[PDB]
């Protein structure tokens, strides 16, 4: 499954993920691609912050979805 992460700088990150992946897993995967520590990452989908301890599935995130990444 592929999703997109848009920063405010205007940059688009592509990730390969599963619905069962945790927000913690997704932040690890963003560290891989841009070397940004998970603790400096806040993920948002459709205006609501995605918290650690829940899965992509928990937030109904399907393939080709765009998340927003902020400090």
């Amino acid at each position: 499954m592929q999703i997109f992460v848009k920063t405010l700088t205007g940059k688009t990150i592509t990730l390969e993920v599963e619905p069962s992946d945790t927000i913690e897993n997704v932040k690890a995967k963003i560290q891989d691609k841009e070397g940004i520590p998970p603790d400096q990452q806040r993920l948002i989908f459709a205006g609501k912050q995605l918290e650690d301890g829940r899965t992509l599935s928990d937030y109904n995130i399907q393939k080709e979805s765009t998340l927003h990444l902020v400090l």
Binding site: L8, T9, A46, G47, Q49, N60, I61, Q62, S65, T66
Partner: protein
């Protein structure tokens, strides 16, 4: 910010004036913020200039005062018990606004919910409550199996169907289960089209989507959602998020609906 009934106030240049909107850090107060941000954008409630932090108690106190001051549409010396009933049922649900509000969508219209005490809060304030979880008429499978059923009816119907002898029902079960799974983010393309057309230009409204409530408006035939996540607290020019697709691929806009850059 950190403690659970504290919110950061964000001041934005709205229509000539520094105007507060409340930001959210954790899940639970979205329904309260969706209403309170409308009252703040309409200047129906005012905060001391550059107040930085507000509590649940303060927001509830302001909202309570607004609800109790609504007058009935038709003025009469007596009766108006139906109106008085709405107000008391609105005052009883008020506290759930900070922790989470139950809704029962029907998939037939952007304004269609089961009428419940929870709905009353928006009705009494004259605030429209919308949703774009609409079954596409061009999927007549879904239209026939989903029907006029509310969400609450449909998940029970799925359970019944799975245990049916009748293969017609088993099949209805599968189509409905498949509707819920493919539209799990609670917004369809058809919903988005119908919502864009039904919403009133310049009007502020509450939008339910993906177990979340947003403040919504329409500018130049386009839908926008107020940005409330505390991660944008410092971004003065990030105020409105475009709603023109179902996959979260949005543009940020300033107070005046002009594209913002970072």
């Amino acid at each position: 910010e950190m403690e659970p009934d504290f919110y950061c106030v964000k001041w934005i240049p709205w229509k000539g004036e520094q105007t507060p909107i409340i930001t959210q850090s954790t899940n639970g107060p979205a329904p309260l913020l969706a209403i309170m941000n409308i009252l703040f954008l309409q200047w129906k409630v005012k905060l001391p200039p550059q107040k930085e932090v507000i509590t649940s108690d303060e927001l509830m106190a302001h909202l309570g005062n607004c609800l109790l001051s609504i007058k009935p549409q038709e003025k009469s010396e007596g009766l108006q018990l139906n109106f008085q009933q709405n107000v008391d049922d609105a005052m009883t649900v008020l506290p759930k606004l900070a922790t989470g509000l139950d809704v029962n969508v029907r998939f037939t219209g952007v304004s269609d919910f089961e009428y419940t005490p929870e709905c009353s809060v928006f009705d009494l304030l004259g605030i429209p409550l919308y949703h774009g979880w609409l079954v596409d008429p061009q999927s007549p499978e879904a239209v026939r199996a989903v029907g006029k059923l509310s969400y609450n009816q449909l998940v029970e119907r799925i359970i019944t169907c799975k245990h049916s002898s009748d293969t017609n029902l088993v099949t209805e079960g599968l189509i409905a289960e498949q509707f819920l799974e493919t539209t799990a983010a609670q917004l369809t393309y058809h919903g988005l089209c119908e919502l864009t057309a039904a919403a009133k230009e310049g009007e502020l409204s509450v939008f339910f989507r993906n177990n979340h409530f947003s403040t919504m408006t329409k500018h130049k035939s386009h839908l926008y959602l107020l940005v409330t996540d505390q991660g944008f607290l410092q971004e003065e020019q990030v105020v409105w998020e475009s709603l023109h697709n179902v996959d979260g691929d949005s543009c940020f806009c300033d107070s005046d609906f002009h594209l913002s850059h970072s």
